[model samples]
Target chain A: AKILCVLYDDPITGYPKSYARADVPKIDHYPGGQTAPTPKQIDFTPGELLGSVSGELGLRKYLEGLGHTLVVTSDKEGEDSVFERELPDAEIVISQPFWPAYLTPERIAKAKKLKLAVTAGIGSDHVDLEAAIKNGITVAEVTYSNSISVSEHVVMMILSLVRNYIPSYQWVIKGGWNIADCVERSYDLEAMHVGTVAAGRIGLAVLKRLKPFDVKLHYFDQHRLPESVENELGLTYHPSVEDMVKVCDVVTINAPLHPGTLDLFNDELISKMKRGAYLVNTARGKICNRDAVVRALESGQLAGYAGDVWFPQPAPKDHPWRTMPHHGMTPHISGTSLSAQARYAAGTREILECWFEERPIREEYLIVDGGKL
Target chain B: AKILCVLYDDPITGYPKSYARADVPKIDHYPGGQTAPTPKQIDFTPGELLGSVSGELGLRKYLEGLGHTLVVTSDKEGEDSVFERELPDAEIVISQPFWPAYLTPERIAKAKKLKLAVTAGIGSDHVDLEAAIKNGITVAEVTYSNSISVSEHVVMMILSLVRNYIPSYQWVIKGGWNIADCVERSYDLEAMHVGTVAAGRIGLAVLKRLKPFDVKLHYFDQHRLPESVENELGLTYHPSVEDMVKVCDVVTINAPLHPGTLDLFNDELISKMKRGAYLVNTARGKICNRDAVVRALESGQLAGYAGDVWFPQPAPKDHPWRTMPHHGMTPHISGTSLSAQARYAAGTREILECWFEERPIREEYLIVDGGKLA
Candidate 1:
């Protein structure tokens, strides 16, 4: 099977523009509690998504070896690019959720040989699911490859916002010892009501990690968690997002986005939250109404807002959240961290290995399968 | 009790320059597990330290009532300032450890009626300890008042430094969605070896907070912790700071600074630490040699250095650490958050009430009394 790898950062033939040479050891284990389908011969440094490691799952051609390649451009389907050149011939295509780079219907029409669309990292919204079923292409993502990574980011944002951390770092940056200025907005995260939108792979991970911090945990989801899980975390479950945000001092969004979840955190819903409540959305961007987030911070209806996800992948240079007040936005980089890259790259190989060996894919990895949603 | 309250922020007669108008409830409940000696009549707002709250520990005079006041100046002992003018006649002086504003031997000689020096918050180093005993003054601080506040700060700094948070924040501020720029320096705080200089009150609090993060916990203390506490944290006890820093990826200094601890994290000890280890010192400024910390960050020997303590209160405009690379430094404000001020203010009241009522001061609050250290 020809596996067409998608990486906008590095190309296979050369050592892309530059990558860190830090003495990082290969990721040897999987989040699934099984060993990596990796061997000792492979050498890797940092996240360039996929690479020509001389010998790996994505490549095995030249004496040096065939490998995964990165073709950087906003338009993945731009003609005469390496990806477009390789598009139709490949039986499977692999890419991470580097948002806005889509595998859409035009590609579905062009890629006659493409049977599988594999997301190297979590979140398959980057793939067109209806189009996938229409074109008979199956979709899957490495399910927990970076759940812990995003969970870590959510907690970091929660504490950063509550403690008024970033603006203080600026005090050091601007060369002043403004004590009153640094602390007037500061607070400890303890004894506050913190909630998550879902208790799935990531929200559950965040709740468990926040367990030691003494926050009264709350959650809202269509499916309530097992009672054992709730009692273990001492979680208070709310029947709806509206009910949950009202009491939460910090509400982190970590659920998947579907038709029902689109534009969920608008002004009407946010007004239900406690004034000065912090909102950390590491979930998909559409889960929040973009303008409502900006207005809430302006009105002090929300004290701080942070998220790595934006409505479109590569949010415009002029996206208001780019310079919005009291935000901790980073370029959707949480799951693409070097440590996370290691696990998901291996997971990508694991999925491809299953397909090539004519074996069953890890059931949890499946999104759309064999012409079914 | 003629309390000479030392506040450098607000005066008793007027509101200070703009403070937060948040709907903050008064901070009750002492860290010592005792109820505050506070009554319902006092009004409050965000942290302006002590205030003219009508009737309280530091005031009770006019038709409105007396209260603690703020006198802003760098020189706590300026010739005509409120602190210096009130120095001689007051029976007691109370202040927080705002650093560099010291009650030294000169004032110890001048304050003839000064029977006590009460610290409004933790850390009594801002007062000259030897002079206190020499001048026959009792020294007491509201112990444990702001320890948890500083401990929360330590955890915030640790996570901020490890995750490479501030730089990413800069990206959002400068309006670039540079994912590679952010994540290349970013990391997870998981699976790393985190250690503390002392496993005392604040250090132990930090350990309890970090328990669920899955880091390998280590510690170096002169006095070992109780076995139950050690087992509870699954700690690896190192006998020396050198031994501890060698294996630790993060070393937080939480022990109090004293003669034995002054300038302890100098080049020699820091050289023994793992390359790229993080150093977070909230304990005190002098515990670390200021220049040595700058050099380590310059050489990348330490990946990050952060603390809310500095050599002097109001570090000069050009203090090298103010603009150091990879630092999460803020002004020395961690222990004085509005929440902290409320708790410590109540604790300060509790200490003063006992002194005026002729009840024994809480043993933990005592530092030097009757010509001896507690």
Candidate 2:
């Protein structure tokens, strides 16, 4: 049976080959306790793809070595996409949250041989879970692979906005030396109250990390954490997002983007938030109303918005957030740190090993199986 | 008595006028019960002085009310500058670390009437302490007013450099989204061994704040902290910086810049440091050799260098650090946050109050008094 994996392109050398460059110093896989060389300046050009280096191709050699065929591609967008053309014959499909190949019900029905779907990294929100379940497909992900990575990113975004770091850094880059102008909006994160919409793995890690910053922490989650855990991290639980956002100077969206959370932070809800507050959404971009976010920043309702996840996998160049004032948006990269890439890449191999041997997959990795969650 | 306050220019309204700009939102002084207005986008133009809205200007009306003349000017760069022109008759000299009017022996000798020198913010190093003390000048600064502010900035710069934040943020501003390029050098701080050159007030505060990130903390200082304090903060004290830099993935310069500590991070010493290690110097520019830093970044001996401190205030437009590779340099702004500004401004006023009333200033605020650090 054939397996297909879809990931973003690393145009320099195509999959596998782009993995190493002759001109540059090799710091990727240092051995014998050697010190690594610093990376040279390289400009990142977006929307270009080369065959051999996407994360999708990470599984190619391993699968081929096991006598299975693997097809990797970045051409996964739109109805006439290569992914749609190849879906019918593929027995298994691998996708990443960073460059998701959405498994809609229409495409799920067409994949006659598709029996399994794997997320190379965490968050299978891109797949239609109900559709995968109905089609007798096992949906699994490399769970806990990048939780710490995203948590670190969340803290950075919060501090970046609250401290007014971007403007100050820009001041430096442009050769300016007026301290008063640079500091007019800069503040200490210690005095403000920070809250997360969900207290799941990423949220809890964020709260734990933020504890020492001496900020007041708040969270709203369907599953309230134990009293001991809450007190240890100095977290206050809000029964609802509305209650939490009203008081927090910074509100981070860490909730899952299911039906209950889709468009959860609409204009009305954002209107209730504290003015000049900052918002971070690394969990999923769809959880926020796109237009509402643009308006909040325009009106100064939200002082800033920052995160890696965007509504579309490769946010079009003209995406409002790309040009939005006071934004620190990046492509969905928080979970794909090289350190994390190593873990999930190894985890993907483990999942494939289990699938081929008919050994039961780890229960925690399974999001939907045997037509149930 | 004349009190000449040499402060940076406020280009918007020049000394007291920038204090109240109608177009700009007023968040400068929020009272006990008030919500601050959101600040609008405004470009920072260097070397221009607005009114006495903040900093030394905060002390203007108060000092003037006490019948002391307050001459605030940004023209403190040369011998014939407003500051040097007015030094002889000035009984008190007030300056800020941001726009310091360097009190050299030549200027000190010319200012025969000068008795007290006050730093509106922290770091009284701008004044020659020995020269000031010899001339019977009382040197004092707002000791803890901006300590935490600078400490917070140190952590931010460390994280920014480690995570490759500037280039990534630049990508966003310049409209690009190549994750591979961004993540190639970006690493989490939790896994690295971090060190600070000193564990004094700012250094200790930085260690305390960085404790939650779960990195191994190392410090090298002339005086060791108490064992209880060390254990409480999980800090590992290094007897020497040589041993400390060899192991640290990130080394922060927090020691005071003095005769003994100038050019402390020269090529010979930096060569001993771990390859690709990041260096943060928020202490003072002179603490690290200017050319040594540019060479380190070029040779990739240092992965990244970030801080707001630069030698020679108003670093000439052609300063190499400005265009150095992997640098996140800013104009000596670590200690001048708006919140810090309010505190130091208040502290500056308090010192003037005590000096004018013949009362004892807080002992902790004194750097050099009676020819010693008393």
Candidate 3:
């Protein structure tokens, strides 16, 4: 059977010149003086769409080793594209935030034979959950795959931005030392407050990790956790995001980027945050208004900003967050560690096994149930 | 009463550069652009030894508001030095790691009337602890003030180095997108073994923060922690540094820099570390052999290296760690956050209060225990 994998091309914007090492040889003749160095590209199966996914959900090679035919392509939306034309024949669609194949309702209807959809990492927002349910498309994701990785990243960004780490590093690189500049912007965390917006897996993990630092832990979640856990961690419960933002020295976003969360951090909401507070968003980037975040950073409403998630994955050069001052923003890679890939890849296969055998998918893997609505 | 704050004239090597901005001119240029667009020179208080000392103990405005004397000078230990000349009369001396004033036995012996020696931040290692005890000079620091800050920093450097964040960041900055170069070298924390050598204030704090990351947390200390705290944090205790280094995916040093801890992370002990493991030191730079760390990073033995502490405070050009590949190293500004500054400044004032009043300082504030070994 033919497998159609519409993998997103690793866009050229953030690609290094070395990665274009293949593209380099054609443009410039070999200078006899220098031996050419091979730039290693991310290895993937050319036969399967899932072959291109990396990080915790990277299972392309594993499946390829089993000798399944895979067809990888980047164009997924066109009517004549593999996502549409090959949908009837393709039994499963494997996608990731790193390279998403947005399965809209219309696309779902077109792919009559498609029975399963797997998200390699946490948060399956790219797929139309309601449509997946309507079509009895069993959907599953590698839940908690990158929680620890992202939480660790959240704390790093928190300290990096709040403490002004990068700019200081820049100062040293450029050959200058003005400690007054460093000290005036620098600080200690002895009694300062740092809390997370949604104290879920990643959020609670961040709080738990930060507990040793003795920073007051504050959290606001949809459901309140057990009081026993709260007291032990010395966590203070904020009634609302506004309440949390008003007081925290740093406010990290770990909640999923769902409809309920999109633009949750608008300009007005950010204005309520403590003046000169640091923000770390390991959560979905779209949850925050892009322009609003820039303004907050510019106005010193946020002491600094750090996160790997961005609205459009593989952020463009002109992406405002890229150049936004007082930021430690990285790519949406918090949840896609190489170690995470091994675990999620096994999880992805387990999920595929369940789908083929008509076994029930794990409840934790389900983000939305279409029949209920 | 005059306050003599002796520190380095420039920012330290291997730590973050935030301290560079703490100088008067930088702060002036930041908000109002008060300094002419191109500032020729910024004046320092004759009492101030260096510019970077401003935020170490969070000393800003309080000294300025007092209208008392504050000297900024870099000449330490010289015959014609301000410190040598000012030592006899200066009542309070504030020094830090970024620009440490080596207070030798002879120096402290000569400073007869020097009532107090204040380490503006943590790590009074630069001071001769034994001499201060004999001389009845009350030594105090902003103890436990920047402990968590450094602890958090330790965890940060561990991940940044081990995770290969710099290369990945370089990937984006250098316009690279080959996931193989980034991912091949990176690994996850879910089940990886990670540990710290010292479980003191900063070490335990490092363990506590690392507890939630779900990695196996191991610690080696001279003394074992209470069983209750260990069970509570689900920490695994190791008796020896050799065993702890052998198993951890990432090992950090939050211990003090002393004879026992100095050169603790040498090549031999480093070889004991798990192949491809990561090492981070947010305590003090001298504790680890600086050259060894660079060699480890260059080889595949160390996945990455990170710390805000470095030897010789203002590391000169061509410092090995500066150009070392795959480093997440920043300047020693971790404990100097605005929030941390607020806490340490207040803590420093409290220490000063104890000195001024001739009161027994809070037990929590005492590190060396009145010249007694801790």
Identify the candidate with maximal lDDT. 2
Better by lDDT, candidate 2 or 1:
2
- After the best TM-score superposition of candidate 1, give how far the Cα of residue A199 lies from its true spot, in angstroms: 1.4
TM-scores, one per candidate: 0.89, 0.87, 0.80
Task: Check candidate 1 and list the clashing pairs.
Answer: A10-A70, A59-A66, A61-A66, B10-B70, B59-B66, B59-B67, B60-B66, B61-B66
- DockQ, every prediction: 0.44, 0.30, 0.20
Q: How accurate is candidate 2 locally (lDDT)?
A: 0.75
Report lDDT (CA) for all predictions.
0.73, 0.75, 0.65
lDDT string, candidate 3, A264-323, tens digits? 999999998777777878788888899999999888777778787776766776678877
Q: How many backbone clashes does every candidate have?
A: 8, 18, 59
Fraction of real interface contacts that model 2 preserves: 0.36
**What ordering of candidates by TM-score runs from best to worst?**
1, 2, 3
Q: Share of real contacts kept by model 1? A: 0.46
Q: Of the candidates shown, which would achieve the greatest TM-score relative to the real structure?
A: 1
RMSD (Cα, Å) for all candidates, in order, is 4.2, 7.0, 10.6
For model 1 chain B, give the 10-residue run with minimal summed lDDT: B54-63
Ranking by DockQ: 1, 2, 3
- List model 2 lDDT by residue over A1-373, tens digit each: 7998887767333333221111211123211232221112212221112112454534666677778998888789888888889999999998877777899999999999999898988878778988988888999988776676788888888877766677777776677776666655566675578999888778887887788666789999999999998889888899988999998888898888789999999999999998878899998888999999999998878878998877765777777888888887767778776556655665676777788878877786789887998
- TM-score, B chain alone, candidates in order: 0.86, 0.87, 0.81
